[PDB]
Design a protein around this ligand. Structure first.
Ligand SMILES: [K+]
Ligand SMILES: [K+]
Ligand SMILES: [K+]
Ligand SMILES: [K+]
Ligand SMILES: [K+]
Ligand SMILES: [K+]
Ligand SMILES: [K+]
Ligand SMILES: [K+]
Ligand SMILES: [K+]
Ligand SMILES: [K+]
Ligand SMILES: [K+]
Ligand SMILES: [K+]
Ligand SMILES: [K+]
Ligand SMILES: [K+]
Ligand SMILES: [K+]
Ligand SMILES: [K+]
Ligand SMILES: [Mg+2]
Ligand SMILES: [Mg+2]
Ligand SMILES: [Mg+2]
Ligand SMILES: [Mg+2]
Ligand SMILES: [Mg+2]
Ligand SMILES: [Mg+2]
Ligand SMILES: [Mg+2]
Ligand SMILES: [Mg+2]
Ligand SMILES: [Mg+2]
Ligand SMILES: [Mg+2]
Ligand SMILES: [Mg+2]
Ligand SMILES: [Mg+2]
Ligand SMILES: [Mg+2]
Ligand SMILES: [Mg+2]
Lengths: 126, 195, 154, 123
RNA sequence: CGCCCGGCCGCUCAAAAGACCUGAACCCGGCCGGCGCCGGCCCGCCGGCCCCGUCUCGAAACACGGACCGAGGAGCCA
RNA sequence: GUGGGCCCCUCCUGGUAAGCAGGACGGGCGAGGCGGGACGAUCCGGACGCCGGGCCAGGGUGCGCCGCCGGGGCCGGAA
RNA sequence: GGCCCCGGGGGCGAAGGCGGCGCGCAGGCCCCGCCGGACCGGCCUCUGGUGCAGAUCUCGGCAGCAGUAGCGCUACUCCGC
RNA sequence: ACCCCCCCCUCCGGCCCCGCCGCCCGCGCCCCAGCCCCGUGCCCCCUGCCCGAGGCGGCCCCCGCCCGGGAGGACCACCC
């Protein structure tokens, strides 16, 4: 139920990178795009514009993809997949895929309790 | 947080304005008294034409939209201070609301304790041969209607304060007689070591 | 359509009309002018509008509505006397008071107008003829109307 | 203020953030200390605990004096949490005595992301 | 079924699904809260910020296209 | 892909001249963020991954508006 | 086209819809609550009518404007509910 | 000095006095000279850090229409 001690997690930017001018028009969605206009101020990166995406923001290779609880994620749908991905571990906790019924989450949960695996959606459907 | 009360007699208009504006932005309440006795360097006639060239600038299509030109000596001083303030922001409007300007010394300020700023007083600032004029005289030439009233009120006030000083003189000869309170002679001698 | 008022610990009387052949903007203002009245008052007030003794003030659809002397203390200067909207609202009010005074024997002396909701419905669609061979629309703007009565609001 | 209630102090003022005409650094505050007119007589108030009262909670915010600024007696200070703009022109307290506030006077980048190469223990 | 003079209440049904599956956006009505983007601080202050696409030596331009929203919409094949 | 360029410094040609037109070595904008020159595609510095600390170029240091004192003098445009 | 260790997930609730956390520099992905009421996929290999803000774009819906602009041929009135 | 500024004259946010009839807040007064500067070249420097009368200065609150005539008038408003 606990992972091994790790380095301190740093996020270099806390908010999301939002598409330029998506706040003016409903038809323009907030998903990121690269500015590519000849007169674009966002492309020229004048002061006071939104920040631009670049690989300098990437995360520390030892902590990238690590959830706040300290574990890395594994996504499973059956009891067979519970055992195969967790023979060797202590780096991963497990997650039940959303489509798994309430009848079979009891079988996965109790079985995974014996193996000594954390499940991250233990108390979804009562 | 007291109020700083400045007697504007003898002071240079622009050198006094710079001080008050910096104090206002530090969260201070300031009053200014005797605005008609402040000083503008230069010949009166040069100063006159300068203030009559400002009054010529108005919005051509409607003068109610235009720059307003105030004629009393207190309001001229207040408009000079606004030039040194970012008055169109919230931080700047809070500073204007902390300022007061008065022609003469009226009863709402008559018992306040006053101060001066000698680094902006004309007898220390201006060379002996430079001409200079009083703000009150400039105002009277551009339209101030109350030059004679301020003088009548100033005269009656000083006579009443001249009688007061005589009784205040005697009070000091009783207040200061108190060298008989030892519990203060224990205060003065410790302050002696550090001074 | 469904009711927009959802309260569940009050004894209320309800009535509605769906798709009413009356102006939407006129009828909204008539319902908002009687909100919070006791049901004795609103019945007199509505008869006075019919007889031009009182006005309906207009807070939302007022460009071109004239200012009149009869609107001195209301918050605005503009109002009208919508006779067809007052005919509709009066009959919807009587059903709600009947519905409440019969489901729980409460008198008209403790009933008040505590809710309303007017909504835009789908109109009749005719045409008009314009110059240079053109045709244009000539439509109606009808409404859905609902009204709730119950005990004094606090 | 039930823990700084009796503490005598030297007055100060928070005039603004550190800035140029183009940019503004909100993580450092500029502060005016009464009776300090020279860069040289800033040594006496150097490195001491200060505080400002946030007049929405009523609680204090604690900080320390770090560097001088200019030639004329201004200083730079860093507070436990960076200040809001509403607090400009307000009064700052420079305590004459010592107060153990633990680590509640130190800035948020130094408390976390301060890089002690350190770890998360998980009990 | 009942009650008032279309409404209410409620009946069939797993469900009104009631003129019909699901039922997004733009836009609107009622109750409740408040008075553009980025950054710092829990939060209304301070600082920065011209309208995109396009042809063009050069566009915020008094150069052109574009009220809004949805779905379709242009280097494939021999 | 491009084969409409333009500007600065020095050096020139036609023209009364021009923010006019045509040529030359080197540099720039084009296709170069940031600070400064109030304000400007090109001038003065400096050419750019995401942060924390330090030092400081160019320009400046009454108040707006971040930052100053001491000392010696003086007090648009042609004939 | 294949695999998914007694043979992948589903009325003990699929796809879609509306809000809310997390993960990724990002394109995007994953989970939870409510709605809905019958189907859906992760990894390897194969294939293409494969990704929109603009084209006086096409078709459909629809706002402000706005209760606004506007409603030749002389003429109707009293009583009968 | 036909120029310029003020009066007269037109509009006028705000304010004051008077009619009918409560709240709160602050605690500080010489004057005049600068080539007499009359013996200077200081004081203050704690607005809570332990301050919290009376007088002297501030602040708040306080006043209906419809209806019908008109010397008034698009509608309103205005005067009765
Ligand atoms: K959007
Ligand atoms: K361009
Ligand atoms: K074009
Ligand atoms: K062209
Ligand atoms: K060109
Ligand atoms: K452009
Ligand atoms: K132009
Ligand atoms: K324009
Ligand atoms: K063009
Ligand atoms: K044109
Ligand atoms: K255009
Ligand atoms: K020529
Ligand atoms: K280049
Ligand atoms: K119209
Ligand atoms: K004149
Ligand atoms: K006259
Ligand atoms: Mg026609
Ligand atoms: Mg025809
Ligand atoms: Mg349906
Ligand atoms: Mg062309
Ligand atoms: Mg064209
Ligand atoms: Mg157009
Ligand atoms: Mg589409
Ligand atoms: Mg040229
Ligand atoms: Mg080009
Ligand atoms: Mg600039
Ligand atoms: Mg300064
Ligand atoms: Mg196909
Ligand atoms: Mg296609
Ligand atoms: Mg589209």
């Amino acid at each position: 139920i606990h992972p091994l001690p790790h380095k301190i997690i740093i996020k270099k930017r806390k908010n999301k990178f939002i598409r330029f001018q998506s706040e003016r028009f409903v038809r323009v969605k907030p998903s990121w795009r690269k500015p590519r206009g000849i007169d674009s101020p966002m492309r020229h990166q004048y002061r006071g514009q939104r920040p631009m995406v670049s690989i300098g923001y990437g995360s520390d290779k030892e902590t990238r993809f690590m959830l706040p609880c300290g574990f890395f994620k594994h996504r499973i749908s059956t009891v067979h997949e519970l055992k195969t991905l967790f023979m060797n571990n202590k780096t991963h906790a497990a997650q039940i895929a959303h489509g798994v019924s309430a009848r079979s989450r009891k079988q996965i949960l109790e079985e995974a309790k014996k193996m000594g695996v954390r499940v991250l959606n233990a108390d979804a459907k009562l | 947080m007291s109020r700083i009360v400045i007697d504007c007699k003898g002071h240079i208009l622009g050198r006094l304005s710079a001080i008050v504006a910096k104090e206002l932005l530090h969260g201070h309440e300031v009053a200014l008294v005797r605005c008609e006795k402040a000083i503008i360097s230069g010949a009166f006639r040069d100063v006159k034409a300068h203030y009559l060239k400002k009054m010529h600038k108005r919005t051509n299509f409607n003068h109610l939209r235009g720059p307003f030109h105030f004629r009393a000596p207190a309001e001229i001083v207040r408009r000079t201070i606004r030039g040194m303030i970012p008055y169109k922001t919230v931080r700047g409007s809070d500073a204007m609301s902390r300022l007061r300007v008065y022609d003469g010394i009226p009863p709402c300020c008559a018992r306040y304790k006053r101060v001066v700023c000698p680094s902006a007083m004309a007898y220390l600032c201006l060379r002996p041969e430079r001409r200079r004029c009083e703000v009150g005289r400039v105002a009277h030439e551009i339209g101030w209607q109350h030059a004679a009233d301020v003088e009548r009120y100033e005269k009656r006030r000083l006579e009443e304060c001249d009688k007061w000083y005589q009784d205040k003189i005697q009070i000091d000869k009783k207040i200061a007689e108190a060298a008989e309170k030892d519990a203060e002679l224990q205060r003065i001698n410790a302050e002696l070591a550090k001074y | 359509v469904k009711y927009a008022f959802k309260s569940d610990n009050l004894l209320v009387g309800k009535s509605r009309r769906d798709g009413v052949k009356a102006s939407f903007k006129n009828t909204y203002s008539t319902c908002r002018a009687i909100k919070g009245m006791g049901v004795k008052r609103a019945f007199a007030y509505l008869d006075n509008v019919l007889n031009h003794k009182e006005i309906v003030p207009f807070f939302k659809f007022y460009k071109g509505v004239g200012r009149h002397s009869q609107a001195r203390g209301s918050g605005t200067d503009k109002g009208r006397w919508p006779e067809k909207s007052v005919v509709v609202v009066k009959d919807i009010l009587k059903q709600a008071v009947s519905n409440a005074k019969h489901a729980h024997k409460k008198e008209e002396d403790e009933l008040y107008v505590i809710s309303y909701c007017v909504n835009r419905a789908r109109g009749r669609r005719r045409r008009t003829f314009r110059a240079h061979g053109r045709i244009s629309k000539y439509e109606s703007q009808p409404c859905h109307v609902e009204l709730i009565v119950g005990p004094k609001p606090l | 203020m039930e823990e700084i209630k009796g503490k005598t102090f030297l007055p100060a003022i928070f005039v603004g953030y550190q800035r140029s005409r183009a940019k503004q650094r909100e993580n450092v505050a500029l502060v005016k200390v009464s009776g300090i007119y020279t860069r040289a007589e800033t040594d006496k108030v150097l490195g001491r605990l200060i505080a400002i009262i946030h007049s929405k909670s009523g609680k204090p915010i604690f900080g320390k004096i770090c560097r001088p600024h200019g030639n004329s007696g201004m200083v730079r200070a860093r507070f436990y949490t960076n200040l809001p703009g509403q607090l400009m022109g307000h009064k700052v307290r420079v305590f004459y005595d010592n107060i153990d506030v633990g680590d509640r006077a130190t800035p948020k980048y130094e408390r976390l992301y301060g890089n002690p190469n350190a770890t998360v223990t998980y009990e």
